[PDB]
Amino acid sequence: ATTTLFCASDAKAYDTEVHNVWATHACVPTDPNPQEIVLGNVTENFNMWKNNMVEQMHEDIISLWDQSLKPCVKLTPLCVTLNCLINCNTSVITQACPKVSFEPIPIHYCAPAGFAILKCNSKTFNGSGPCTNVSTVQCTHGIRPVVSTQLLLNGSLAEEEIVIRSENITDNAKTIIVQLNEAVEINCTRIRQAHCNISKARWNETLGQIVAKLEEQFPNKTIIFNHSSGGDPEIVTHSFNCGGEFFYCNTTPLFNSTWNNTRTDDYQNITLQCRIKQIINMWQGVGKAMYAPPIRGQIRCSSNITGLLLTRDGGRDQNGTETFRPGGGNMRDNWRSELYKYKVVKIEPLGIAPTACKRRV
Amino acid sequence: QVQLKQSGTELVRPGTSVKMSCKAAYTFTDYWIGWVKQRPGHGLEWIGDFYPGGDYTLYSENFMGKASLTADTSSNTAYMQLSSLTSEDSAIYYCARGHYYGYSYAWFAYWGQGTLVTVSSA
Amino acid sequence: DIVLTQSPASLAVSLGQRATISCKASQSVDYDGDSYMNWYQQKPGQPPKLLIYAASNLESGIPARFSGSGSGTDFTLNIHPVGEEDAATYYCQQSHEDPWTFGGGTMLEIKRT
Amino acid sequence: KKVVLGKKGDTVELTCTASQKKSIQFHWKNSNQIKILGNQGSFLTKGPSKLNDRADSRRSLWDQGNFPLIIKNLKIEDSDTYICEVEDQKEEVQLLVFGLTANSDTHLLQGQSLTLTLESPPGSSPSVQCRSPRGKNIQGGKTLSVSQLELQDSGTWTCTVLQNQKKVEFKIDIVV
Amino acid sequence: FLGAAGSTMGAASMALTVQARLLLSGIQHMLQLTVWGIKQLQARVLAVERYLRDQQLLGIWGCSGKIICCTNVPWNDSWSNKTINEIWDNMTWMQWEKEIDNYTQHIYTLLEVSQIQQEKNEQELLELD
């Protein structure tokens, strides 16, 4: 089916948080006691790259952002229909800019009366492959709409091992997603300068595990990392949001190490430079956006890293090598890593069959 | 941090045409550069504004027919060409960067050191 | 064009005292509420820098001493506290519409014993 | 297979096209399977190749399907096939670049011969269709020459070059 | 609700009678939680409504007021080319539904025409009695 699902959040409705305000205005409390039915020997073909739920949560998040961070100037273009100099002029928009707090809140998605949601249970799921241990429910777990690129922030972990997912390998066109099984701490703290620290003792092991899992697809070649190849500042370097501040951070001292079956990285605290901004490139279309000056100071952020986004560089000039650069930026890609299980279904009772009896006439 | 540089000072004869260069090194693409002139007792006045990402043009009326700008993003260098040299054309010249879209002019976070030009027959 | 007039022509301040410079325009420049004025500073032997932009938002790296205010055709750049380093020529510019027009410039000199 | 010709110094557009009007992903791949550009959400990411700096794209037509590929400061060695990947098709185009000019920079006289230099891609046979103000319509292939050069032949001769039915106009510097 | 998917056709048919016999034998609150009670009651009411409406509308083919009817349309061989035991002991319901999904539009018209013919003949006899 293609029905409309409603939000469900354990909001507060007393604080100044914009997420709390939106949840209070349009969301309802959670189910007091969930009920899950464990179906038996069934087999259904799951597909995640072609799901339809994401196309709705991605349009709900954008609506959510229209109540928290209003733009001082919202400069976007608009063209006039002319076959071909096609008319194209910039349009200006402006409103008030009152500084407000901002912290994501968990949100639940539920189906209305008449539909159900199947969820898988296999430990691997093969990506877009059929699984058997299925169950039926009416609502999803907690989801945080945290936004970022080049690195997945606070989010659910894997079951028992880090896994890699891709729509079609061997085409150097689709982003590769990786999910870990143990988060790695990150701490960012700071007028226009700040630093970020990540535990190297865990990050080295994480990279080792990722590479070890990765060699299977490409056994003979040698896997090597490399910094971004260039582009907009929002994708060349890590970018995220914290406390009404849009943090941009370079990530060069993490992908310069060429990797083999052995270690070649080093041999405490991994320093990471960061500088805030005021003129950013929007992710909901095209056009710049500007906000009010930053807060006085003393802003801290502590988060966990669970997932990762990696791209590939292929060609016929490759000579026993494989360079994996960091990418991302397609919010749909960032959000498919959370709704790759659930599938919305409707029940059909009717049926026609040939039997051995005959009507009495 | 974006940085700009310019060539050295020049002595030129009147009535000829000369070309100065400004080299910018983040690389600039789909940006919108302008040129500025400084002469004693006149403050500042912007001359020409071009957009390399399409080579869009915008001139000041007073300089019409006097200044022609060009750009080569392969070498990341803009060029000021001026002909019909006279004594009044002796001045300092600066190149100014920014970012794209038409009437931005709000993020001139840096300027070049400037090049001196003197028109004399000595 | 929008002709700008700055004041005062010459300005002298004792160290540690308030400083103010005014800029006036012949035609309004308000467009959706944002004030399109830029205040630049010039010192001998070095090129000018962007010191204040838009009259409501500060440029990074520049100490917080600077501020701006005003409306319509009368705007004011304020400096506090003044220091020995601030003696220089300040220019007020309009960033509303092309072609653009600089002001007359104002000279600030540090007054000492 | 649309084919275009360059000039060694000017830009050129190679437009794909769609009909959904929803900013669908795409790419621009050379004949060696190397990325050059490509939308990722609403940002831009240049390919790790030899044309990273020169490449560009119009960021206002993405809402209307047309995803061009503007290349600046074109050079001869850049002649090769390119392919779009709009939804699942393989819209592709070809470009050939050859630089035609005059070797004699400024030192020219009256009563001498003039020879032009054409740098065409190795493996192509464009035909130079020259044109002169005095009606000197010298017709030839890639290589052309002139045995006379005098005052009456002033002005940059508009000796174009056509191949596969597509012609590009060039000019020759003539100073005497 | 007649059975759990995955089980074969014959097994469900056999078990439904025992289920009917068994069913006949009779053998931390948030004050905003009140919404969920309505969310459940609406679903139950809609289920009952749909059941009644479908039962009433199933009467065109003459099979009204029943859950297992029979008709008078002969079974061809070009549709399935399959026997009784293999169908009724294998080929879970979803697979069988997928198998003959192409002809699922002609059979409706055929059955409706057969019902019309039977009704016309019965009324013709009624003219006699």
Author numbering:
A (entry chain A): 48 to 131, 193 to 298, 326 to 359, 361 to 395, 397 to 404, 412 to 505
B (entry chain H): 1 to 25, 27 to 52, 52A, 53 to 82, 82A, 82B, 82C, 83 to 100, ...
C (entry chain L): 1 to 27, 27A, 27B, 27C, 27D, 28 to 109
D (entry chain D): 1 to 176
E (entry chain X): 522 to 548, 563 to 664
In the authors' words:
Human immunodeficiency virus type 1 (HIV-1) envelope (Env), a heterotrimer of gp120-gp41 subunits, mediates fusion of the viral and host cell membranes after interactions with the host receptor CD4 and a coreceptor. CD4 binding induces rearrangements in Env trimer, resulting in a CD4-induced (CD4i) open Env conformation. Although the epitopes of bNAbs have been mapped to the closed, prefusion Env trimer and an occluded-open Env conformation, one class of antibodies, CD4-induced (CD4i) antibodies, recognize Env regions that are exposed as a result of Env conformational changes induced by CD4 binding. For comparison, we also structurally characterized CG10, a CD4i antibody isolated from a gp120-sCD4-immunized mouse that was developed to characterize conformational rearrangements of gp120 associated with receptor binding.
To compare sCD4 requirements for V2i and CD4i antibodies that recognize Env trimers, we solved a 4.1-Å cryo-EM structure of CG10 complexed with sCD4 and the clade B B41 SOSIP and a 1.4-Å crystal structure of CG10 Fab that was fit into the CG10-B41-sCD4 density. The CG10-B41-sCD4 complex structure revealed an unusual interaction of the CG10 Fab CDRH3 with residues from both the B41 gp120 and sCD4 in which CDRH3 residue Tyr97CG10 HC was sandwiched between positively charged residues on gp120 (Lys432gp120) through a cation-π interaction and sCD4 (Arg59sCD4) through a hydrogen bond. This architecture requires the existence of positively charged residues from both gp120 and sCD4 at their respective positions, likely explaining why CG10 was classified in the “stringent” class of CD4i antibodies. The specificity of this distinct interaction was demonstrated by binding experiments in which CG10 bound with higher affinity to gp120s from subtype B strains such as JR-FL and YU2, compared to a gp120 from subtype A strain BG505 (46), which can be explained by a lysine-to-glutamine substitution at BG505 residue 432gp120 that would disrupt the “sandwich” structure. Finally, the structure showed limited CG10 Fab contacts with the β2/β3 V1V2 strands that are displaced by sCD4 binding, rationalizing previous observations demonstrating CG10 binding to gp120 cores with V1V2 truncations. However, the structure of CG10-B41-sCD4, a complex of an Env trimer bound to both CG10 and sCD4, revealed a direct interaction between the antibody and sCD4, which further explains the reported stringency of the requirement for sCD4 for binding of CG10 to HIV-1 Env. Here, it is demonstrated that CG10 can directly engage both gp120 and CD4 in an open Env trimer-sCD4 complex. CG10 exhibited characteristics similar to those of the V2i antibodies, i.e., recognition of the open Env conformation, but showed direct contacts to both CD4 and gp120.
